[PDB]
Amino acid sequence: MIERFEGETGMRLLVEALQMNKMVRGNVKIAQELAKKIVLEKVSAGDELIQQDTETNDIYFIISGSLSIIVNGQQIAIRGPNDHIGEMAAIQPTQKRSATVQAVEQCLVAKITEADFSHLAKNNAELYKSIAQELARRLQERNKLVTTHHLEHHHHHH
Amino acid sequence: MIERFEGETGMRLLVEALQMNKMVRGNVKIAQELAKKIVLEKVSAGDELIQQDTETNDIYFIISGSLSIIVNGQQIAIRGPNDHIGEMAAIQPTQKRSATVQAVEQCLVAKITEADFSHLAKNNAELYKSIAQELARRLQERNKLVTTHHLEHHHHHH
Ligand SMILES: O=c1ccn([C@@H]2O[C@@H]3COP(=O)(O)O[C@H]3[C@H]2O)c(=O)[nH]1
């Protein structure tokens, strides 16, 4: 789908794409500035765009496809069109990637570096706000009960 | 407690407890302005500062004491001094309280209205960034609980 979004002719639909992103929420100003600063990447199915406990700090705006969020071997969510990933490392200068993010399928993403993002968010506070809202949602979702497994051990030494 | 932080005499100790807040991160200008627009309240052991599915939207900076965070009858966290509460209902303005907040002992909290907080934060990007950062930290701790395998061992030796 890249070719639709590439170049000056692609900009009309690149800006609208980024307007639909949950972190942008329709703001043309942020979308236009974001459009100037992102780089388009395709992601192969099964690719780990982000790996847990690595020290990348890029943010990805998901235009197309979907990705597994995996912590310590277990999937805890999936993220699809108009979602974002990598914001947690981008707003915390000393935190490693909290999760592996793996393409369930072929995806198209807009990548922005921490340096370009922090410079934009500096004077577009509402990006920090909209990130907070997303993190609030992830926090408020399906707490359920963490199971304790009970084991009885009969130990024999040789 | 409240005596220490009230009036001109108290302002030095009030600003100091405020600039120590997880949301203020040592910034003096923000602490000084916060102080100008908070009301100190004593919260008593047992008193529900905030009730789940209620529609208050004040933010509280915890200066002294600690409080239970409760979702549908059962606790999920404790917030101590330098924490805050009610920050989500000043980030999602159309949303009821997500949790009850019951004081575990006598507390001194600083209450600011949504109106005053929003006005302050609007020209002070860092408050929204600070909120995002603490929500990211809390989601990290949750990723860890949810994906940690919890095991209860009973060992018999022969
Ligand atoms: O409950 C959730 C839902 C989504 N995520 C994402 O995993 C990403 C991993 O890298 P990061 O730490 O820079 O950013 C993270 C988030 O975007 C998560 O960690 N937990």
Numbering used by the authors:
A (entry chain A), B (entry chain B): 1 to 158
Question: What do the study's own words say?
Answer:
3’,5’-cyclic uridine monophosphate (cUMP) and 3’,5’-cyclic cytidine monophosphate (cCMP) have been established as bacterial second messengers in the phage defense system, named pyrimidine cyclase system for anti-phage resistance (Pycsar). Until 2021, scientists reported that a group of bacterial nucleotide cyclases, which utilize UTP, and CTP to synthesize cUMP and cCMP, defend against bacteriophage infection, proving that cUMP, and cCMP are authentic second messengers controlling anti-phage defense in prokaryotes. This anti-phage system, termed pyrimidine cyclase system for antiphage resistance (Pycsar), contains a pyrimidine cyclase PycC and a receptor protein with either transmembrane domain (PycTM) or Toll/interleukin-1 receptor domain (PycTIR). Upon phage infections, produced cyclic mono-pyrimidines activates their receptors PycTM, which disrupts membrane integrity by forming transmembrane-spanning pore, or PycTIR, which deplete NAD+, leading to growth arrests and cell deaths, thus protecting the uninfected bacterial populations, a strategy called “abortive infection”. In this study, we aimed to structurally, and functionally characterize both cUMP- and cCMP-synthesizing PycC and cUMP receptor PycTIR.
The structure of PsPycTIRCNBD–cUMP, solved in the I4 space group, contains two continuous polypeptides from residue 1–150 and the C-terminal His6-tag, which can assemble into a dimer, similar to the known cAMP receptor protein (CRP). Binding of cUMP stabilizes the ligand-binding pocket, promoting the formation of an additional short α4 helix. cUMP also causes a large structural movement of the C-terminal stem helix toward the ligand-binding pocket, producing dimerization of PsPycTIRCNBD. The dimerization of PsPycTIRCNBD is mediated through hydrophobic interactions, including residues Y128, K129, I131, A132, L135, A136, and L139. Specific recognition of cUMP by PsPycTIR is dictated by the N143 sidechain that forms two hydrogen bonds with the N3 and O4 atoms and the S98 residue that forms one hydrogen bond with the O2 atom of the uracil base. Furthermore, the sidechain of R138 forms extensive cation–π stacking interactions with the uracil base of the bound cUMP. The cUMP ribose 2’-OH hydrogen-bonded to the side and main chains of E87 and G86, respectively, and is located at the α4 helix, whereas the 3’,5’-phosphodiester linkage is recognized by A89, R97, and S98. Changing the cUMP recognition residues, R138 and N143, to alanine or serine, rendered PsPycTIR insensitive to the presence of activating signal cUMP, supporting their roles for dictating cUMP binding. The cUMP-bound PsPycTIRCNBD dimers pack adjacently to form continuous linear filaments.
